[PDB]
């Protein structure tokens, strides 16, 4: 695995802020709304933690953050499995 | 979908990753403090890796233990490379 040139995670972060209401999502996740914007802003040094990435993915049922996380290291998107 | 699992998948991967690799040698390659680097892999400590930190360590070690545990904590199969 090698880190890519194209910012796949940065484009996944900007797109995640596009779809969801940041005020409502930050409240449900118990996050300061400005800190959530910063961790989604590739212009700011704030970054998500693994527990934060799972929580936001769980509440929204959207894999944008995780899929962009995987493409940066050339992994295909999450393929879930149940049972 | 994408629900959080109650098993410590990412935690157990952090322990296995920490045991497999020398922490001092990885810290000087990754440009991190060796004590901070252990804290991220110690589940009993609240320190966590940032997304750039996980890509770098996966790059330097060519070991997908942390990424696969990251995927397993929310019910994703292990990483399948793109391979150009």
UniProtKB/Swiss-Prot annotation, chain A:
Involved in the establishment of lysogeny. This is Regulatory protein CII. The chain holds residues 4 to 86 of 169 of the full protein.
């Amino acid at each position: 695995f090698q880190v890519s040139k194209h910012p796949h995670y940065d484009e996944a972060c900007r797109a995640f802020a596009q779809r969801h209401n940041m005020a409502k999502l930050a409240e449900r996740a118990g996050m300061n709304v400005q800190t959530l914007r910063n961790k989604l802003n590739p212009e700011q040094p704030h970054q998500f933690t693994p527990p934060e990435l799972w929580l936001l993915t769980d509440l929204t049922e959207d894999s944008t953050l995780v899929d962009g996380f995987l493409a940066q290291i050339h992994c295909l998107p999450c393929v879930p499995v149940n049972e």
